[model samples]
Target chain A: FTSKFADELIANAAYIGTPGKGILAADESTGTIGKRLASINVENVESNRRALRELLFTTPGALPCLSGVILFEETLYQKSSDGTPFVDMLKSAGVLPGIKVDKGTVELAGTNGETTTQGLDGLGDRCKKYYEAGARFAKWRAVLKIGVNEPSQLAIHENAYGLARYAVICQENGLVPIVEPEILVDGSHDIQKCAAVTERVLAACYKALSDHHVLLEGTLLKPNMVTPGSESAKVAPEVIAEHTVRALQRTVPAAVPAIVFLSGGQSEEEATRNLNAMNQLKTKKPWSLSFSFGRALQQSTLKTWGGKEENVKKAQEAFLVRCKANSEATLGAYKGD
Target chain B: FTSKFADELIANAAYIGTPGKGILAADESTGTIGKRLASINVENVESNRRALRELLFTTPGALPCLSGVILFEETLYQKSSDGTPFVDMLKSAGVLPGIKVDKGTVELAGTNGETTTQGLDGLGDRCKKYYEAGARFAKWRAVLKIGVNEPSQLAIHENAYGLARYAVICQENGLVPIVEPEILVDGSHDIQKCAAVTERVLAACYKALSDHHVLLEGTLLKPNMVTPGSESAKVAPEVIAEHTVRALQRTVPAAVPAIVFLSGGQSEEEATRNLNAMNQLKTKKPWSLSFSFGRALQQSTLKTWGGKEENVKKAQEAFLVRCKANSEATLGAYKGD
Candidate 1:
């Protein structure tokens, strides 16, 4: 009975939707984000938050290289020093602005404390207003940590459905949803295990999207790449590429405009190189391969800025370097700068 | 972060969880439910509703014969003439009560007028309450129509995810979810089309259940049997049974306790005979095959009751007859009444 939120969702989807060209994930959770601040010895404060995001957005090449910039709720409404709305700033720079709509993760009973994504209450309305405020897309992150007998069926279903519901609401509100069901790379699982889980996770996601009647072409997927747990032996790029592509091909629909890989725990260069190799693979991918790097893109930029006004230009330039690397990596054109 | 309604969704998943012992659906929606009332010229008033349900609950051999009973919300709170709540009546009769949870179906955009099941708003809380009200299981029906480009991927995915999400919420609330994504037999599609859609829809549902971490052992699938649409040439019960079992085997999880069939538009005898034949099939089934009939079981019973207070006994007898028929059919023992 509702009119199509198709055009808005589609425009926003294509804005950041491309194979190997992914999202720039600056939308870290509050706790983890503070750690990024700790690395640079900058206290996590409101002003510091504004300054850090400003650096990432205004970074020289970021305007040309980044397709979309995801923001935490607080940042969506923040302004630059000159009082310009952050959303307006992104639009002027030709980048799509997205808001993180999930409240956060919550535990599901009888699942070893596995959690599902939340924040669905009033999500539809929030998406509508965000669109009115110039945000063309939305993000919802569901965290799935690994453990023995964990990531239980309850955990996967709740989060996946939650994300799907959120995505559908965004489409109804004219905002393309970047559905992120991240299986955290924090355990000792092997690469094959990660691959299986990633494949399984994505399979669940696409099914949920379909169940919610989501217009896949008008939305995007923000998923973590298939990789072993951080403590496991690192595999070669070719191996990662093969497994990752196989997983995506088996699950991601041809109609989804793009898949933007999340850099959960991968280092900046590692994420970039892995993305580049995945794109270089010969597998036929139905959706565009893209990147949605958060720490991978923001870590160095923040360290350079250290929340200081004097370091703004250098920090912005450093931010641009990360952006450019990911952009090139997405295109399989990075030359290892 | 909200506590589950306290019933392990997996716990209730057991009764219907009997492999090859699927549910006998007697849950009819309000409109269709009224037709049975019309048959007897019964007013279909509040008392008539209560009396009819009471008769079904008091039917002999239901518990050992039926795996679950899907109740409209109103029936969940109704009581027998002796003041026993319908929940208790069913409990005393040995049948687990499963509540229907979806609000209804609504259209999907970008799809050919296909609809997805709603009622997800506050589903978590509703499941908890239903569990507390003595429901061991729950049902949420997602209807799909058959036509050229019908039961679109959008409809299949939408319903699949709805069932998956509902199943987990039921589990979280300590009730087994009867996952029902019924592709309605409304058009002229043949058995093959129904089978394909069933396979696709069930595949998507299972994938979603995995994504949500729904416990398979604690879930019962209430699916429509693969059959020709209403206006199509009717397939033989034996052929229908074979196709239905094959589809479930390929798509449903071995971990699930049962597979109850929904008699979407099948005549009572046709539904019963199909179920009986399915039970007779010599192939391995991962879950139970049973009935979830609405009109198939109640049409004649309501006509016999005629809404007269004096007809209560006759209604009870009619109810008993249908129950016995289904019980025999469940074991492939039906020889025609």
Candidate 2:
């Protein structure tokens, strides 16, 4: 294995795993982020997008608690009002700039609506370019769902090995790969089923990573926390924490620097509390448990801002609140939402 | 599975599983055939290749005992000495013409010398082209080696899911895919070790095939027979039969039409005898146990022909001997040494 990136990838990945720090999954695509803007009645333009990322990046006291901020291409290259590149700003703020590298998903033939992520073509080149753009990490998401026959073996293998292949590619190109196998919270499945599914997916991912020679210590995991389906009665944060952490212990390798949870639509409050509960649990967790939330981190903040100039300060405060909450949650110091 | 081909593929696959017949794996690559040709002091050219294949095809009564013939790309298009296309002759004789679709194995990064096959690029179109060339089925080889920390999950997953994807592509293009996961018998391991590895590999394969929606009935399994590895003391045919059959029972789905054994340099006599023992054993085998031997089937025949025209009839007789032996072996009627 050609691993000249070992020293640096491990260092940056370790930086992201700082006990009181987490990642900001602002890597949402234009199509999806436009939906977020639509929710706030903001015009869907590149200018508006830059304003929001600039707002989040320059949020007073927020950067201290953030270890990474994943970038959409525009935000990665754009600047704050003073003409500071977002990458330059984050670099100065001790934050690793991460890029979303997956193009999107495509359906597997004759599958039950299962799809595999497909940004692999030209990815090595893309990674090198993203690295030269001041990005130190990459996020590639593989989405799965729980149906009666869902999260099929084909889907799990495709997603797992796909992430592993991406991991080695990104790893060699000097970017710490954050593999996200995010199972949807869309089904009415119970937490038990969710835990089992999570375990299976995690097991496959780690197995593939090992086979692919991924430097686990230089890789970060961005996975969904164990919780019931969206339509099911919710479990207590303690129960969620127990299931989530136990699944991690069983499947995730200790060599991984962190297990960053993706909210996938969990409410900001619930997400933070569940994360905090996992940190508070009395068990052995070899890797730091943190958050890499997009919707969960920015929901209340975007709503408070309401795309109005006058509400910008209030929005910054809202963003700070969630960041502080998640920061503390990573250290088991979050008392409540 | 838009499986209008389900009916056709299953029928052709079953036809290839006729209890009295098996496949002739004349699918050696140009490079590989050169080695075989060199063994007989024959010129390694297209003409010699044609002569060899024609000799096998025209061996009196050999076609009745041959359910299928897996051909290399050139052989699929070439004809006999009298300008009769080999495919035409095989078709006229009620034999299915199969093609080898795998390019070959490529070394995977950072393993104990493990590899995954790499012919997947532009495969669907290749399958369609092969189908148009009178190929009703396809053979793809995934080579796995057994050693300490070998046949790593990466290799197995790649080979298994690789075969699954190929199976579906060929299925869609009107060809039954003969998925060959050939475990190299190069270790000093015992039959028990081979059985365990075979189970793991086959289980993963069927799981992948199921997920990829490959019609199991339309796919054929070409696997290595369970036996002690090369350097180990050999076990009796019955012991090999018991281990092989029991392993298949645990992993192979009943929907598959045939389980064909690939003889990776196993001597022709032993290969035939072991196959016979498998047929003689009293067990519940849902799929037909059969042969897809290239080296084993043609070993003595090639030597007897010795690149001489006068030896053509003698070479055909040698070919007839192995064919008839394996033919009876498939039905447990072989009493030869």
Candidate 3:
């Protein structure tokens, strides 16, 4: 059922998903939205989501800095306060509309309760729907955790295959798949351990994407920065950046558009610094080293909003500052005070 | 939605789908069933399916000879003339019943038109239904053809992820998955080419399986024996056996219980001889090396049956001969006449 036209679309997507211009991940799931809300004790509601995404979409000076913006299923069809579709908002903002296709992570057996992403059932159909909804790309997140003997072969294979399958379905339906095989920073493993696990997991992921005929050109990867667990000694972002890009170069196909690093629980500054360092690392980086960060870009913005309309301008400024930092970081030029 | 009882069934099924004592190739699809039908000149019809499977299920000595029997989707619920569900028939005969999960193979892009199996849509529901229908295992076939740069990285990755996704769906629905990534022997590549491709494809397959977390203990692999393309210089079954088993030992995890060899394009004798030789090879052969033959198992039998009622007994005997030969091969002792 795949045609040459579809092939071209898929290939072109890979170009955009390529490394230097990584994605701008705005596709936070509903529950994830709640977590960001919990931080400010603000009850997350539909209107809150609409308002927040609108702010991201309307970022006055950040549009030129992003290649793509991923949206949750609900938000893709949802319009701005005005009547236009959110996807159109993204397209007009000079960004491609991408959708999150994975259902979520489910626990795996025998691996300290690690998990793999679900959502393959009718994924092809979902991609078609999201394509019609104006998405030019899609994202699927498969999470793995680090521990001694953790990120077991089971978790790695499961999550890698999850992303590959998602990527193909997206390709068949005219959307670039932002393949995310995230190794969570939820363990006490050292940065070396993190690097090893990330290498193994990402290798498995890219290999799977290749096996699936997932026009890598039309695909992007959203992967974790090579970092130690939350409880471990912190490493420099530059180190994480160097290690992470090297891993991607070895594993990711040259065809993929870019490698968009997921902030993945990193503090705002840490994520930006790591991303900046990745952008500058002296190496033959295969794809773009860019950001698809969520919290790293919005933590301060949310805190500034404080759920009040009167604070909208303040939130926009907060959004602009974070955006500018990430924007500059995208080109290896961000210098935060 | 998964309980310990379901997990046990799932695990049990996976155990059989594991590497060593691989599945017995009993579930021939209808068209495949027809070649045996042609042997008897029986119209390739539903009743023909019933008759052939009935012959298979009623084979007096199979319970001790086979661990799992992959059935065409039709045969999963097909019944004996006495009205028993074919699934129940296999269960009573002490073999796990497996359904072929992929719809069949489809053309892959950018190759000389190599094919990869499709059928992943709605697979989770199908597995659930099949499990409730008494199937403990599921089979999905992914075909790769060897050529110059033939089993391209694209083909390997595509099939690997397909099997991985199918395996996880089967696991979630409590069916042990038999991952069959078969590289067809239709080229002129030598046995060494076959061996290299076999190792690469398998490395990709197992890695993909691990990526999906499909519970290795509960899964089995149905793989093609590493042999030169059908037109190339044929390696001795002993040589084929050595190369095949060594490849498996290097890549396949010990946790997988069996490695049932898919007799892709091999003659019955060749399939049996190769399987027996591999079983005889002294290596770290952890999983059971077995057979899942289709035409190799039925070609002579079909030629003998000719659709005559009086010929049914002879067909049974012919079927038994193939079974007995494979059973002996399973013990590394099939002495070809």
Candidate 4:
């Protein structure tokens, strides 16, 4: 099943899952970034977005803990304040650059507000260009929500199919795909429902990937850590880690290079602790259990920066702490802060 | 968990599975009908298409053996030569009418020329109208092809989700959806390959159906009969029936009332013989084994008609012969022509 680009894809995906290393998801939409900036009373302009990414990328000691950086379209082409290409700078520091390829999710008719991911149109060409621009990997997310009868089979299959399609196209163009099917932690369901749904979603995705002739060795799975709803009684990190690892063990193929957990609305410390516990659990996890966190990795940094030049060093310091914590968590050695 | 229309949907589906009766898929599109017309030197005109269906529906003894008739959008509203409403006429004769809901298939990108069905947009409203017009059942065909790497997972999933979506919509509007995933019998593969592909496709379909909350009891499956490719060495009818029934048993739930085999390019005798063998087999077949044939049931009838109005009686006789043969097949009593 290996194609001509198979070697390249496998190599890049393995590199991204290097021991004690995972992805930095800086691929927030412009509107999402606007909210981040709004919290600090900063103008949500191009210059500020560029500055924020530059600060994170140049954070001392951060690159050593990060294996890859997922870039928003604008940041992929933007330059730092010193005029260095962002992609080039990341590569220069041994970090692989990846692009977010999904347009977002839209309502699937005849369902109870379930959705399918868009952005499949012209994705092959986009992946080709992203590869030529020094991106060695790509990310496409398909979201699901839990409800009384939510995440209907339509949404799960549609999103899984979308992610698999993205995977094959990325591999065809020499970029490894981070197949992310993020189930939102928005319901009042307990951890068991979350675990069951996540397992089902992942099972559907891998089956789809196999159906598309995707070489599993070349793909990375970005799944949500199995946890109860935000409003539900919180479980211990040990319980979360046990359920999450069990779900992955049952659904993820051994050939996949890694399972980089999306920190879906989890607090910074909670995300790290969960990853640490998963890695520490006495189970046979064939793939690397790591983090591909967005807000969990950036909330403290964004708050520390406060939209001021003088706070740049302080923000980087905060960024380095979270990155190092996740790095340790990837190795099951993090000490809770 | 039943809608107001649930009982009607269940009743119509069950009635279509009447021991010695099945559906007559006369819902071919204009383009497909034109090909049929071309073979007989008849002009591809509206009147001729209407005439062909009129002959099939009004055939004196055909109705007793036909539990359902699937109508094309054009034929749904078309009147008979004597101005009798076709739907009304069929109802008067104890044969329920159905409509084809999907527009057709479209190519899925990144596949080996695989496709997904369209016509989902505004499908709910269309089903309501068709239901209002005395159509108690519906058909939406999603085609797959077997190859070295065909029927890509994307195609299987996209089509499965589409079929499920179509099914729920049809039920909400009082129509039982004939979930048709016609795996084209155009490859050079063996019967084993066909069975494997059909099983995989169906497993995915039912999972999506469950995911979409579709009522399996109110649904009918119209699947391609298990057979070797046209170019492959043909197997015996018993072998075909065994493989076909096993594939269904493995993937289809017993709650489904019936599985009506699509001819999928099988000859008239071939279709009936295989179905007959299925019924005669010593196994636990929870659902009825029957036929929803198009070309298999019409080839000789059309040839006998030869586009001549005077030959209508001859064509009706030809149609009657095949219907009676299939009816006997349904009862596992057909001895062959």
DockQ (CA atoms), all models: 0.06, 0.01, 0.03, 0.02
User: Which digits, one per residue and each the tens of the lDDT, describe model 3 over residues B116-173?
Assistant: 8888899888888888888877788888888877888788888899999888787788
DockQ of candidate 2 relative to the true structure: 0.01
How accurate locally, in lDDT, is each candidate?
A: 0.76, 0.88, 0.74, 0.87
CAPRI tier of model 4: incorrect
Top model by TM-score, which number? Answer: 1
lDDT (tens digit, per residue) of candidate 2 on A1-337: 5578889998999899899999998988889989999998998898888888878888899998999999987787787889889899998989999999999999988778889999999999999999999999999999988999888989999999999999999998999999999999887899988987887787677667755767777899999999999999988999999989877755665457788999888889999999999999886576789999899889998899888689889999999999999999999899875
- lDDT, candidate 1, A209-320, per-residue tens: 7567677668888888888899999988778888788666556654566788888878888888898998787645545688888789877877778767898888887887
lDDT tens per residue, model 1, B1-337: 1225434554556566443234545566667667777766766677777767767677655555666778887888777899888777667656688888778888899888889888888998998788789888777878888878877766777787888777767677777777778788888788878877887787777777766766565667778898887888887889998888866754565456567777776777888899999999986554567777777877777777776768767777776677778878888899998
For each candidate, report what fraction of the true interface contacts it reproduces.
Answer: 0.12, 0.00, 0.04, 0.00
After superposition, which runs of candidate 1 have C-alpha atoms over 4 Å from their true positions? A1-3, A19-21, A29-32, B1-337
Where does model 2 sit among the CAPRI classes?
Answer: incorrect
Listed for every candidate in order, the interface RMSD values in angstroms are: 10.2, 14.4, 12.2, 11.5
In candidate 2, position B185 carries an lDDT of: 93
| Candidate 2 residue spans exceeding 4 A from truth | B1-337
Residue A315 in candidate 4 has what lDDT? 93
TM-score of predicted structure 1: 0.54
- Evaluate model 3: give its TM-score: 0.52
Instruction: Mark the 10 consecutive residues where model 4 chain A has the least summed lDDT.
Output: A246-255
